Amino acid sequence: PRVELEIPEDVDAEQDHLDITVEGDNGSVTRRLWYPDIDVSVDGDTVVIESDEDNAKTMSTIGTFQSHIENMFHGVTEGWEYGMEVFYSHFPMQVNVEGDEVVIENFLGEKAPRRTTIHGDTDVEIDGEELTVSGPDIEAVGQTAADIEQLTRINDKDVRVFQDGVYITRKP
Amino acid sequence: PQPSRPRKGSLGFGPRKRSTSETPRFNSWPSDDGQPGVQGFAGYKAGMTHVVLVNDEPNSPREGMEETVPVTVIETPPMRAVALRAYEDTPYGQRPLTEVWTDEFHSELDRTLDVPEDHDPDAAEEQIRDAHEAGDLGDLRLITHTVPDAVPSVPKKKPDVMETRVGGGSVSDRLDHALDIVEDGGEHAMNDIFRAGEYADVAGVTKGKGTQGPVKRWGVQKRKGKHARQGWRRRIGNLGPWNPSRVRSTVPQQGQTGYHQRTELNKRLIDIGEGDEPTVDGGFVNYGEVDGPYTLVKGSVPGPDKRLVRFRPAVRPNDQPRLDPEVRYVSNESNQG
Amino acid sequence: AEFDADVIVDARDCIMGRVASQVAEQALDGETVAVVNAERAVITGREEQIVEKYEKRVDIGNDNGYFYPKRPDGIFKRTIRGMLPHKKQRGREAFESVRVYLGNPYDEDGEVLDGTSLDRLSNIKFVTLGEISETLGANKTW
Amino acid sequence: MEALGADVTQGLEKGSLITCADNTGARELKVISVHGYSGTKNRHPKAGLGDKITVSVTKGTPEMRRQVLEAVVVRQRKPIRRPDGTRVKFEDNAAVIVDENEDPRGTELKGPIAREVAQRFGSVASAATMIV
Amino acid sequence: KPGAMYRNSSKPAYTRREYISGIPGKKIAQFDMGNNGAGPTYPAQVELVVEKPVQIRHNALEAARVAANRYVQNSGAAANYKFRIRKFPFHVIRENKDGMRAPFGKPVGTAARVHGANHIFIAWVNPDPNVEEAWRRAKMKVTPTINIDSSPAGNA
RNA sequence: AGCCUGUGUACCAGGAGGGGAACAACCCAGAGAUAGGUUAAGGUCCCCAAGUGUGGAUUAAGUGUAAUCCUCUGAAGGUGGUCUCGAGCCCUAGACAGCCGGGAGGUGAGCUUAGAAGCAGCUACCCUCUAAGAAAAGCGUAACAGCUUACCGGCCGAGGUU
RNA sequence: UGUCCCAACGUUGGGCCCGGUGAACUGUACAUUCCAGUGCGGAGUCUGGAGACACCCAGGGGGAAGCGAAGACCCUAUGGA
RNA sequence: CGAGUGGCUUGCUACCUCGAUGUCGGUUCCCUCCAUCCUGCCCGUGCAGAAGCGGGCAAGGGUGAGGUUGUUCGCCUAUUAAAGGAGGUCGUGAGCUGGGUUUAGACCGUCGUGAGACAGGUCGGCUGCUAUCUACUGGGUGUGUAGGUGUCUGACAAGA
RNA sequence: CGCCACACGGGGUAAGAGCUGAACGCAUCUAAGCUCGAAACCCACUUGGAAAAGAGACACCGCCGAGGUCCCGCGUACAAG
Ligand SMILES: [Cl-]
Ligand SMILES: [Cl-]
Ligand SMILES: [Cl-]
Ligand SMILES: [Cl-]
Ligand SMILES: [Cl-]
Ligand SMILES: [Cl-]
Ligand SMILES: [Cl-]
Ligand SMILES: [K+]
Ligand SMILES: [Mg+2]
Ligand SMILES: [Mg+2]
Ligand SMILES: [Mg+2]
Ligand SMILES: [Mg+2]
Ligand SMILES: [Mg+2]
Ligand SMILES: [Mg+2]
Ligand SMILES: [Mg+2]
Ligand SMILES: [Mg+2]
Ligand SMILES: [Mg+2]
Ligand SMILES: [Mg+2]
Ligand SMILES: [Mg+2]
Ligand SMILES: [Mg+2]
Ligand SMILES: [Mg+2]
Ligand SMILES: [Mg+2]
Ligand SMILES: [Mg+2]
Ligand SMILES: [Mg+2]
Ligand SMILES: [Mg+2]
Ligand SMILES: [Mg+2]
Ligand SMILES: [Mg+2]
Ligand SMILES: [Mg+2]
Ligand SMILES: [Mg+2]
Ligand SMILES: [Mg+2]
Ligand SMILES: [Mg+2]
Ligand SMILES: [Mg+2]
Ligand SMILES: [Mg+2]
Ligand SMILES: [Mg+2]
Ligand code: NA
Ligand code: NA
Ligand code: NA
Ligand code: NA
Ligand code: NA
Ligand code: NA
Ligand code: NA
Ligand code: NA
Ligand code: NA
Ligand code: NA
Ligand code: NA
Ligand code: NA
Ligand code: NA
Ligand code: NA
Ligand code: NA
Ligand code: NA
Ligand code: NA
Ligand code: NA
Ligand code: NA
Ligand code: NA
Numbered sequence A: 001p002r003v004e005l006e007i008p009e010d011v012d013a014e015q016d017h018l019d020i021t022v023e024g025d026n027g028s029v030t031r032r033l034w035y036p037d038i039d040v041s042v043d044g045d046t047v048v049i050e051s052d053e054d055n056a057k058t059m060s061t062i063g064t065f066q067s068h069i070e071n072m073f074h075g076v077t078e079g080w081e082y083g084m085e086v087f088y089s090h091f092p093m094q095v096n097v098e099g100d101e102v103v104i105e106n107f108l109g110e111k112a113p114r115r116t117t118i119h120g121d122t123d124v125e126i127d128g129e130e131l132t133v134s135g136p137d138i139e140a141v142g143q144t145a146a147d148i149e150q151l152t153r154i155n156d157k158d159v160r161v162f163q164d165g166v167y168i169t170r171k172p
Numbered sequence B: 001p002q003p004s005r006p007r008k009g010s011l012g013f014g015p016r017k018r019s020t021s022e023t024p025r026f027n028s029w030p031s032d033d034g035q036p037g038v039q040g041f042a043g044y045k046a047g048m049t050h051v052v053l054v055n056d057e058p059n060s061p062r063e064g065m066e067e068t069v070p071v072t073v074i075e076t077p078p079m080r081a082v083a084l085r086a087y088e089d090t091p092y093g094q095r096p097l098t099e100v101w102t103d104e105f106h107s108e109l110d111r112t113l114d115v116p117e118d119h120d121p122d123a124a125e126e127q128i129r130d131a132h133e134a135g136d137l138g139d140l141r142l143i144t145h146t147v148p149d150a151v152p153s154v155p156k157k158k159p160d161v162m163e164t165r166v167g168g169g170s171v172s173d174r175l176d177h178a179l180d181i182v183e184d185g186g187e188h189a190m191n192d193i194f195r196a197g198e199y200a201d202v203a204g205v206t207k208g209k210g211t212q213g214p215v216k217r218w219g220v221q222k223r224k225g226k227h228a229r230q231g232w233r234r235r236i237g238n239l240g241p242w243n244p245s246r247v248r249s250t251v252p253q254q255g256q257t258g259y260h261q262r263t264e265l266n267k268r269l270i271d272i273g274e275g276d277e278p279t280v281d282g283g284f285v286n287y288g289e290v291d292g293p294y295t296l297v298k299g300s301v302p303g304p305d306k307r308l309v310r311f312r313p314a315v316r317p318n319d320q321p322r323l324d325p326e327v328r329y330v331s332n333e334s335n336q337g
Numbered sequence C: 001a002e003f004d005a006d007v008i009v010d011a012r013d014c015i016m017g018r019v020a021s022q023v024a025e026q027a028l029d030g031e032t033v034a035v036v037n038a039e040r041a042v043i044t045g046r047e048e049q050i051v052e053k054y055e056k057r058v059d060i061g062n063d064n065g066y067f068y069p070k071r072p073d074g075i076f077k078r079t080i081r082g083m084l085p086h087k088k089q090r091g092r093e094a095f096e097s098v099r100v101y102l103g104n105p106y107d108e109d110g111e112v113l114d115g116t117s118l119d120r121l122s123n124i125k126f127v128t129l130g131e132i133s134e135t136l137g138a139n140k141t142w
Numbered sequence D: 001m002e003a004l005g006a007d008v009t010q011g012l013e014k015g016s017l018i019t020c021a022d023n024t025g026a027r028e029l030k031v032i033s034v035h036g037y038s039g040t041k042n043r044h045p046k047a048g049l050g051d052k053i054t055v056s057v058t059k060g061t062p063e064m065r066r067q068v069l070e071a072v073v074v075r076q077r078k079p080i081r082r083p084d085g086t087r088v089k090f091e092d093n094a095a096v097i098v099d100e101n102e103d104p105r106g107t108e109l110k111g112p113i114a115r116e117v118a119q120r121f122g123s124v125a126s127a128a129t130m131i132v
Numbered sequence E: 001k002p003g004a005m006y007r008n009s010s011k012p013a014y015t016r017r018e019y020i021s022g023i024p025g026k027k028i029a030q031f032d033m034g035n036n037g038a039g040p041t042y043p044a045q046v047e048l049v050v051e052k053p054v055q056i057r058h059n060a061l062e063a064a065r066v067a068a069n070r071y072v073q074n075s076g077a078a079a080n081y082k083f084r085i086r087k088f089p090f091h092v093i094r095e096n097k098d099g100m101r102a103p104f105g106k107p108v109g110t111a112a113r114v115h116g117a118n119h120i121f122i123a124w125v126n127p128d129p130n131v132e133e134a135w136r137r138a139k140m141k142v143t144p145t146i147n148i149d150s151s152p153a154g155n156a
Numbered sequence F: 001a002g003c004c005u006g007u008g009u010a011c012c013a014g015g016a017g018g019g020g021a022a023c024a025a026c027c028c029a030g031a032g033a034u035a036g037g038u039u040a041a042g043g044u045c046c047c048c049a050a051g052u053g054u055g056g057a058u059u060a061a062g063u064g065u066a067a068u069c070c071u072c073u074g075a076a077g078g079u080g081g082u083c084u085c086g087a088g089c090c091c092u093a094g095a096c097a098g099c100c101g102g103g104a105g106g107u108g109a110g111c112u113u114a115g116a117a118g119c120a121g122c123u124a125c126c127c128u129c130u131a132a133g134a135a136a137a138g139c140g141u142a143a144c145a146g147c148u149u150a151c152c153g154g155c156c157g158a159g160g161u162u
Numbered sequence G: 001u002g003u004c005c006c007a008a009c010g011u012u013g014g015g016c017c018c019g020g021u022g023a024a025c026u027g028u029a030c031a032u033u034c035c036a037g038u039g040c041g042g043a044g045u046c047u048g049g050a051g052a053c054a055c056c057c058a059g060g061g062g063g064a065a066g067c068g069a070a071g072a073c074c075c076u077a078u079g080g081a
Numbered sequence H: 001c002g003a004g005u006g007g008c009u010u011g012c013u014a015c016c017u018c019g020a021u022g023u024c025g026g027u028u029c030c031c032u033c034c035a036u037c038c039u040g041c042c043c044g045u046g047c048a049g050a051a052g053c054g055g056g057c058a059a060g061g062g063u064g065a066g067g068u069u070g071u072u073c074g075c076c077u078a079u080u081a082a083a084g085g086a087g088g089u090c091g092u093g094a095g096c097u098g099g100g101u102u103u104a105g106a107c108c109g110u111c112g113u114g115a116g117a118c119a120g121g122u123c124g125g126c127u128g129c130u131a132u133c134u135a136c137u138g139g140g141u142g143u144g145u146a147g148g149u150g151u152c153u154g155a156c157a158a159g160a
Numbered sequence I: 001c002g003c004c005a006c007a008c009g010g011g012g013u014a015a016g017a018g019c020u021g022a023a024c025g026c027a028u029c030u031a032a033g034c035u036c037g038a039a040a041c042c043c044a045c046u047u048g049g050a051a052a053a054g055a056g057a058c059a060c061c062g063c064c065g066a067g068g069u070c071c072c073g074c075g076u077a078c079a080a081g
């Protein structure tokens, strides 16, 4: 097999060994694409994912590499953003970004603040009861969002009753 | 049904053999946080007395009130860092590289060592600095020793030598600091390292009791009821099961008990002074009278009167330091009666 | 320190056992050998299982004892001992005239024995001796 | 529980017969258990000052006898160490019957009581005649 | 008692009732189910084919047959289909319930001997194979692994 | 059952030597001494004599590297893990999926019922517009609304489905 | 009331070292073993591995299916009383 | 109804020991297993909370004291986070104990003509040995590394 | 029976919660990659440890003399040693 991805005019993608870096106006993202017998290369204008095998496991990865790369293209140009909405019922939940990590205070009356460290060059801009996670690296971003939502996870009581927490509102 | 019960004694202090060096050897040092400094000091145990203090604990419903504390007195006269030893990182751990010695030696340091008569301080210092440049310099420590002669109650004069790590800011900054200390005469004091109110880990070789039975050596029961009248009183039921057909080392047996090294963690330094204020009337039993640089350590301290004990800034404290505790009274009443 | 190795072998990206097999065969022919860059040797397999075996070996034991290395250093050497009749005179000789090192303390670059090399390009299920050691709890002195 | 503000040497055991320092109609008590206590193979459960124990009435009024009530140790013969290093010991081992809420079943407490007991059992305390 | 005790065809044939007495009755209720009034005039005919010679206790048969027929009530108590269990528990079975002394056992039950590849069950249905499911539930209660086979039916 | 009791036969007993990790009866093998040679069973990465042998394919579980067996377990039941081979049907007159748009009216059918309007129950299930569109397959409502399946069109582009 | 919680300290005679006196039990051989396996199915000696520098002192007895007694139980004898 | 795992129960078998491999219970002391009673992390719920119920990972640690009974088991009490189970020659008598089983004495009941019997009860009724080897706990002397003093390193080992 | 001291925190996982993601345009926590996550695992901490046969390292003293044994007074040590 062999797939060819024509890189966007806005982007530049270079690669040495198993590492691929994509750079655009929005930034740069590097990724390790390592899988048995799958060669990835920057052919001037196009990125080529090729292998000599065709068994399901390979094709499986090939497809994974593809989307992975395209997501990079998108990230360095348009970028990636996740929308989130803080929500509480009795205790006013206070979400602030302090340093390289978002902090949630007074969650369910909790004296102890809840926090998580942001991943990579992800921007977590908070405006009122709305959050916006953005960055050129979908992996980082996607996780930063997810962590934030996970951070208000609750197991001890009924969730249908205790719904406080921050949630992903819009997925890229 | 046979009730459960925890095994007798711990398997964390073994083998339970006599110690190699009557002088303690820390196997862990504090973290390199603050400024450059020697991470240890020593002295000779003297005895015990209590002291009244002001509840210092902020979380105590008694903070501010009187409180009698048991304190062990320790004569901590000055010591002398006679040399700076350097270690290099290697595929097989840390290894001593060279050493920087001095010329000014205590009149009686030759009762233990073969004091240097010809030593090249600078080549050594160079070798080290070239190691650091290459970045193969491992931590740095000072060969130190005590001055038993300074302590009348202690019969020995032959000094007790021991290496102690120097932790500081940058390696370069503490390397220098070390050299400065050594170069002088190596002379330093408990004040230069500790401050009353701080916590310290006190090492030392416990009191020896020769061979003892399992009952005392491991805390196993004595024979009870009628079993105690039959010819067995302080022997354990059995050395094990039929199979495996061998006696497992984990079974409590007779042996050398005491005279083991013990590093007692988080001891609070109640006060570092000098003079004869802590000394008791009649004289500390089997020791003598104190009157010079001393330390007051809260609680107990391993080892018997006259044994060399070693201090180190706690490596795993639990509380925050509450400096210089107010001492309203120190009992000087006779330890006899 | 100083070892007149008639042969210096580089284990980096080489299948431990396939190296050990040949290193034994040679030492028994009277060859003094030195294995270099142990920490970079590899063994194929599902990492998780592989570590369970080695970890089990560290835990095995009794009063009589079962001393198993944790450093990629010994690991390799014990692997080689297993291929020599180390309790016979001949064997102990062949085993003693062999030495494994972390990295390379020599000037020369070791050679790579035929059929012991692993292509990282067409291989993802394998582990580094060093990796194994870090799990066992060794002190990454390399 | 709350810190007694002292160090105690349990002077009592399961099976121990103490005095009922109150006018409930119960004269003697028999320690059966010690609230919150778990001992060790062969160790007789021990109880001391300020411990809430379970009891059975050994001597007293017919209607009080044989009853399994709860109580609190108010005094013991074995010494207890106070913050200033002093030791304190009483003339006997006595306790006071108490209820679910820890309020004295009785009206009056006969004899002295260790101050420390206050810091745990108010109503008992606020019922005391003499508090040493 | 377990099937492991009588599931193999290792004993001689023991079926002569003229020399055996005390034979427990068969738990099997019926051998013809569905519309037995009508004859095999159906488009589709599937069969449950056993894959290894074994012995099947009347216990297993009844439980295997009920489970399927009882389930074939996805079609109605008087639905349009005919079910058939072509095997009968002929082989008598004993148990030695003295130790090994005079151990010839006492009749405790009967089992039908099925050879590998025989069809123990046969159902007739119009293109409405709910039956294929009635059998995933039937060979669920018999010792052997089984093959659900369809004969007249190319309406795939 | 490494159980009890027959039968035919070969073995152990009373049978060495070679192999099987060890091991009476499993494999070769029936054996005077000594000597050279070639094999048998079994084996050729090391321990250990001889292949890190050749062409090709599968497996990723360290499955496995375990003829036989007290000894080597692993079963009914399950698997869109993966490889191979076959059959039917659909597709550049654009398939399979996804996304967009459409999903109309007579009419909220009749009947029952205060009520019922696709969708409580009962009966029927008719024709118009059109490129589609049920007298409605699933939710949802007190009943409506609302959300979608069927059905049609577009975008897209290669095989797809059983 | 130390039978117990729960053990402590002490006294006397031993124990330990020295001089003198001076046995016995036991012994196919070999023997520094451990974990598994195998074997007449309960191995220091076989097989695979592991561990193991030699000698000596004290100890409490896990193993040698430890030593001591041709099993008193059970069955068998064309036994005895 | 059907397929299994374990080797704690019971039975089957008669391979091992009758020139003896000391019995039951308990006790003391040691290691282990997980099929987990508590403790940590989880999933579901007929999950509002609190308290539970069911399930998953997990054996680090814990799992105790008493009343009757020789009892194992079990019944009962009060505490408890919980008061889980099992293997180790049903671990453990060259360690203890000796209540029970199982000698000789004796009674009662039933059977027997009788001597006497009991898969009945009962009162009484013995616990040997100086450790050769091995094992382990502690303690020394030599030799190897190849002149001495002092200070360390750390392959690995133990811990709850 | 009295008194003193005995963490936390890192790292990797199970179950489990998730991210990105294909085979299979969709979907999907998994197939490649990744974030988290147990009193359990590794480190941390205590204790032993040159007999680790790769039998170690450093400083000084000494090879006609450094140091050590015996000797004498005693124990912070001890059954002999
Ligand atoms: Cl006892
Ligand atoms: Cl070990
Ligand atoms: Cl060997
Ligand atoms: Cl691979
Ligand atoms: Cl209790
Ligand atoms: Cl012949
Ligand atoms: Cl493996
Ligand atoms: K016997
Ligand atoms: Mg709740
Ligand atoms: Mg006796
Ligand atoms: Mg005194
Ligand atoms: Mg006084
Ligand atoms: Mg007891
Ligand atoms: Mg014969
Ligand atoms: Mg060869
Ligand atoms: Mg296997
Ligand atoms: Mg087989
Ligand atoms: Mg061997
Ligand atoms: Mg005989
Ligand atoms: Mg007889
Ligand atoms: Mg006669
Ligand atoms: Mg015996
Ligand atoms: Mg489990
Ligand atoms: Mg355990
Ligand atoms: Mg009792
Ligand atoms: Mg037993
Ligand atoms: Mg037991
Ligand atoms: Mg005996
Ligand atoms: Mg014994
Ligand atoms: Mg004896
Ligand atoms: Mg008796
Ligand atoms: Mg009796
Ligand atoms: Mg009796
Ligand atoms: Mg030698
Ligand atoms: Na005796
Ligand atoms: Na006695
Ligand atoms: Na025994
Ligand atoms: Na491998
Ligand atoms: Na090990
Ligand atoms: Na019979
Ligand atoms: Na089946
Ligand atoms: Na023959
Ligand atoms: Na053989
Ligand atoms: Na394997
Ligand atoms: Na006494
Ligand atoms: Na023994
Ligand atoms: Na089984
Ligand atoms: Na059995
Ligand atoms: Na015998
Ligand atoms: Na016993
Ligand atoms: Na556990
Ligand atoms: Na009981
Ligand atoms: Na016994
Ligand atoms: Na005995």
Ligand code: NA
Pocket (backbone or CB within 6 Å): none
């Ligand atoms: Na963790």
Ligand code: NA
Pocket (backbone or CB within 6 Å): H145, I050, I055
């Ligand atoms: Na050495």
